[PDB]
Design a protein around this ligand. Structure first.
Ligand SMILES: [Mg+2]
Ligand SMILES: [Mg+2]
Ligand SMILES: [Mg+2]
Ligand SMILES: [Mg+2]
Ligand SMILES: [Mg+2]
Ligand SMILES: [Mg+2]
Ligand SMILES: [Mg+2]
Ligand SMILES: [Mg+2]
Ligand SMILES: [Mg+2]
Ligand SMILES: [Mg+2]
Ligand SMILES: [Mg+2]
Ligand SMILES: [Mg+2]
Ligand SMILES: [Mg+2]
Ligand SMILES: [Mg+2]
Ligand SMILES: [Mg+2]
Ligand SMILES: [Mg+2]
Ligand SMILES: [Mg+2]
Ligand SMILES: [Mg+2]
Ligand SMILES: [Mg+2]
Ligand SMILES: [Mg+2]
Ligand SMILES: [Mg+2]
Ligand SMILES: [Mg+2]
Ligand SMILES: [Mg+2]
Lengths: 82, 155, 80, 129, 123, 205
RNA sequence: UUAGCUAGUAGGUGGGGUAACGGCUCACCUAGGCGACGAUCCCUAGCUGGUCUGAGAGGAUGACCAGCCACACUGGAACU
RNA sequence: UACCCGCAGAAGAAGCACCGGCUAACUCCGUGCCAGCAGCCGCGGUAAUACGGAGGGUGCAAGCGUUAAUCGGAAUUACUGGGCGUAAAGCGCACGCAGGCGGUUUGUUAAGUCAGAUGUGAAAUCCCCGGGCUCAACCUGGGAACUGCAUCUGAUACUGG
């Protein structure tokens, strides 16, 4: 079905994830429906590192989109941050 | 303070009973760096006599061009025999981007920022001839105002 | 919301069908001249009320035959 | 045949001007009269008149300055063989604004400057400097 | 000239005809030496220029220059050829790559060695 | 990747002192400064228009210790940047760390300063920077790190520095062996017998 | 240095058919339909975002990344 | 692993093409229309800066040259932006269908043309200002751009009906 997950861009040894809503069958870095956040695991954390349009994430869940283990974590982490 | 530039030197030849007589030609431009440009062309058996005859010609036979803060008023086309010539007022910082023959003319003229290009024959004597006349026929925001009989914003 | 085309009837021979030509001017992509282009459409004319030469208003609809995806809305001018 | 009378108008101006003629005259037309209006209003000619009712002859009084023709160049742009239309944001300017382009709009014939200021595009009839 | 005319018959750029068709847009080609000989050049020059006829892996058979002073090439020598005409030798449109395959380097070269397939001399 | 050969040859070919030695000596007592290198140095070059453009670009490159590829890329960036390209080229050169290290007097030459940089003797903002072409920014503080502070090269380097004209846009504390890149140098800060527009001309044709 | 092409052909009625409109299919009827605004035939070719070049307009191009299509030894076929 | 500290010693780390004009860089010796060079012109028969070696020099540099290949310069297919008396180019001449173009006035229409609004023009790429790897390549935030298409509503001077 439709799922919200991380498409891994960035460079070798320097991962950078683009959070995307997509048909789960399409390849990880392939066709998606909507971009909805990003996630830098290598951010200096002096400034940002994790940004989620929670309004559109929820909208898609409301219509049955599932959510990665890793995005489900980010959302709990970001909800905690503020 | 007048600026003078040697554009091209060339060997021509004349034939007589005894054989070929070789001589030289010199094409130069003088300018005041502030809107005045002359070109000269001299002939002589030795090169120095030729480069010198030309400057002499270049000093008189000099004309004025209505510059605009070191750049042109509007794009201009020039033509003479083989050479079609084209020039544009560029913004500040660019400098003169142009062929050798034209650069020398524009430099000594005081045209600080321009886009130029020569089409057809790049024969130096006719290229410079075509540039000078282009700059010379180049009219000014004030003369068009005078012509049209109105000192509107366009003045 | 009534998208529509206007053109003239080049053939009325078929039973309940018609051929309509839509002509327009178009700027030439390279040389700038404005060129006539024509689009011929097989259109449905139940009742065959459209005569050749007529000027008619047509609309797009579902497939009616291998080549008909348009039907008649109404006649505009006729019998020049 | 006489399939572009506007080029004809431009040219009669250009040639009589080159021939240091005091005036030029041509069969009239609203469209010529609309262009003559712009020329006069922008000071490229003195004045103009149309005379007669059934076969109107239009007359343009040319203009000279330093024993020179005020009209330096005058060229047809759009033409029967190749119509040229421009949008407001695409309107050419002649001599970096020193000259003018005559433009025909939904609100009648005016200069590039005018049409620009009035948010319009149109058929580019000619350039004049 | 007319717009109308161009609208009926567009501007049509001429397609460039190549000067080394036997290469078929390859940087070199391999081939067997069919004949290995000398030939004299065109006005105003004069010499005995070393050339070879070479049947290439793609069937083409061409004449190719053997530059440098001295070469040990014969029939059935397998060589590598590259583009490059010999101007005073009409017909000759390729050069042999000295020091590749069966073609040896020029003997005793010190300057421009790499254009003649010559190793750097121990020194 | 670095020019390693004789240095005064370069000065001799360009017709000027390129500061490739400390300055302890009048350069004319170390070489025939006013004569090109080689058998035909005495010969005069009746030098083409292309020639003068080439030599001027070489001159600047040889001053800063930059090879062609990097220097061309410097031109490209100067061009892309806003404002006069010629001046932008010199800002970029003058912002190099090996250069700045030299101007604060930590190195007798840009070559020596570069070695200081490469050999992890220089810090920027208390952080070790060891690549010569590191672009230094306004308000940065470059310093000799503690362990490199007792190197006698550095003391000598600061002495000579005190005898050169003192650059405006740098605040140097000789005691601490730290210094501050206050601002980008203006054009007027840099020598006036550099002809950038020639270099600009060479790279536009 | 290809000018004519077309019998399921173009349309109509009705039955059948598909997940669904449809000559998709069949019978009957009408004689149409396409074409110099290039049909038919012949040669070549996956298309695009874009890539390279060029001041631009253009020219050339369609590896790597992404979107669509097509194929899975060759030709054909359906089953789930 | 990145990165940080320590040890040993300049220690293990420089080649390639070019130097007649175009084109930055010149001399000697050898050869003698030979051997050979050659992107174009063109070098070689006794002083060859053009062949080959040397010394010297110029340009690049972990590359440097040669070949192949696209565009550029090429206004040399010219829409922007060319030509046809003698340079390549007016059909030997006329009539004429299709086609292109069409004098002047009014009204009408509103397809061309013009304006506005709305939707769409995937992301990446390009560009701008920032952020992150010691810098850079590279990665990345936001923007701008996608100059296009379509629908609706208007304007009516010019073109078309
Ligand atoms: Mg020419
Ligand atoms: Mg490198
Ligand atoms: Mg049925
Ligand atoms: Mg194929
Ligand atoms: Mg793959
Ligand atoms: Mg692969
Ligand atoms: Mg793909
Ligand atoms: Mg199969
Ligand atoms: Mg030289
Ligand atoms: Mg050579
Ligand atoms: Mg000799
Ligand atoms: Mg090539
Ligand atoms: Mg071209
Ligand atoms: Mg021509
Ligand atoms: Mg005659
Ligand atoms: Mg002829
Ligand atoms: Mg005739
Ligand atoms: Mg009305
Ligand atoms: Mg940074
Ligand atoms: Mg980005
Ligand atoms: Mg963005
Ligand atoms: Mg996009
Ligand atoms: Mg009308």
């Amino acid at each position: 079905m439709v799922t919200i997950r991380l498409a891994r861009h960035g460079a070798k040894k320097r991962p950078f994830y683009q959070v995307v809503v997509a048909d789960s069958r399409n390849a990880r870095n392939g066709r998606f429906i909507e971009r909805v956040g990003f996630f830098n695991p290598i951010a200096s954390e002096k400034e940002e590192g994790t940004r989620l349009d929670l309004d559109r994430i929820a909208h898609w869940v409301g219509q049955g989109a599932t959510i990665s283990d890793r995005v489900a974590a980010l959302i709990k982490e970001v909800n905690k941050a503020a | 303070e007048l600026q003078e530039k040697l554009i091209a030197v060339n060997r021509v030849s004349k034939t007589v009973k005894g054989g070929r007589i070789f001589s030289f030609t010199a094409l130069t431009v003088v300018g005041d760096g502030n809107g005045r440009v002359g070109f000269g062309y001299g002939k002589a058996r030795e090169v120095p006599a030729a480069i010198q005859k030309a400057m002499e010609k270049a000093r008189r036979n000099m004309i004025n061009v209505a510059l605009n803060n070191g750049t042109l008023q509007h794009p201009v086309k020039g033509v003479h025999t083989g050479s079609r010539v084209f020039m544009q007022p560029a913004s500040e910082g660019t400098g003169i981007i142009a062929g050798g023959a034209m650069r020398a003319v524009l430099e000594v003229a005081g045209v600080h920022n321009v886009l130029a290009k020569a089409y057809g024959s790049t024969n130096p004597i006719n290229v410079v001839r075509a540039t000078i006349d282009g700059l010379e026929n180049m009219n000014s925001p004030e003369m068009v105002a005078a012509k049209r009989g109105k000192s509107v914003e366009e003045i | 919301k009534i998208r529509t085309l206007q053109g003239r009837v080049v053939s009325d021979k078929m039973e309940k069908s018609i051929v309509v030509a839509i002509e327009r001017f178009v700027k030439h992509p390279i040389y700038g001249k404005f060129i006539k282009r024509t689009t011929k459409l097989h259109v449905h004319d139940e009742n065959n009320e459209c005569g050749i030469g007529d000027v008619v208003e047509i609309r797009e609809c579902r497939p009616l035959s291998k080549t008909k995806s348009w039907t008649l809305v109404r006649v505009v001018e006729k019998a020049v | 045949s006489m399939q572009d009378p506007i080029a004809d108008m431009l040219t009669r101006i250009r040639n009589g001007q080159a021939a240091n003629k005091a005036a030029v005259t041509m069969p009239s037309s609203k469209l010529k009269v609309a262009i003559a209006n712009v020329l006069k209003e922008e000071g490229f000619i003195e004045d103009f008149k149309v005379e007669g009712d059934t076969k109107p002859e239009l007359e343009l009084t040319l203009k000279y300055f330093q024993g020179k023709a005020v009209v330096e160049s005058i060229q047809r742009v759009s033409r029967p063989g190749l119509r040229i239309y421009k949008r407001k944001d695409e309107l050419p300017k002649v001599m970096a604004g020193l000259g003018i382009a005559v433009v025909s709009t939904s609100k009648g014939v005016m200069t590039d400057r005018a049409a620009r200021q009035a948010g319009l595009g149109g058929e580019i009839i000619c350039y004049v400097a | 000239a007319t717009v109308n005319q161009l609208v009926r018959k567009p501007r049509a750029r001429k397609v460039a005809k190549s000067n080394v068709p036997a290469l078929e847009a390859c940087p070199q080609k391999r081939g067997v030496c069919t004949r290995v000989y000398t030939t004299t050049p065109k006005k105003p020059n004069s010499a005995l220029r070393k050339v070879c006829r070479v049947r290439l892996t793609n069937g083409f058979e061409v004449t190719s220059y053997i530059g440098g002073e001295g070469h040990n090439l014969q029939e059935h020598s397998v060589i590598l050829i590259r583009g490059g005409r010999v101007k005073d030798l009409p017909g000759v449109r390729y050069h042999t790559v000295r020091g590749a395959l069966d073609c040896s380097g020029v003997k005793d070269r010190k300057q421009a060695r790499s254009k003649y397939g010559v190793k750097r001399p121990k020194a | 990747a670095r020019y390693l050969g004789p240095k005064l040859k370069l000065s001799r070919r360009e017709g000027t002192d390129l500061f490739l030695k400390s300055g302890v000596r009048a350069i004319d007592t170390k070489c025939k400064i006013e004569q090109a290198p080689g058998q035909h140095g005495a010969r005069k070059p009746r030098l083409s228009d292309y020639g003068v453009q080439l030599r001027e670009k070489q001159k600047v490159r040889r001053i800063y210790g930059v090879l062609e590829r990097q220097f061309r890329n410097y031109y490209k960036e100067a061009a892309r940047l806003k404002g006069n390209t010629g001046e932008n080229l010199l800002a970029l050169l003058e912002g190099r760390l090996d250069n700045v290290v030299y101007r604060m007097g930590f190195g007798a030459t840009r070559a020596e300063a570069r070695q200081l940089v490469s050999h992890k003797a220089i810090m920027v903002n208390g952080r070790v920077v060891n690549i010569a072409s590191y672009q230094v920014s306004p308000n940065d503080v470059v310093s000799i790190r503690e362990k490199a502070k007792k190197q006698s090269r550095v003391k000598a380097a600061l002495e000579l520095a005190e005898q050169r004209e003192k650059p405006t846009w740098l605040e140097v504390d000789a005691g601490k062996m730290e210094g501050t890149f206050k601002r980008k140098p203006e054009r007027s800060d840099l020598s006036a017998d550099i002809n950038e527009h020639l270099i600009v001309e060479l790279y536009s044709k």
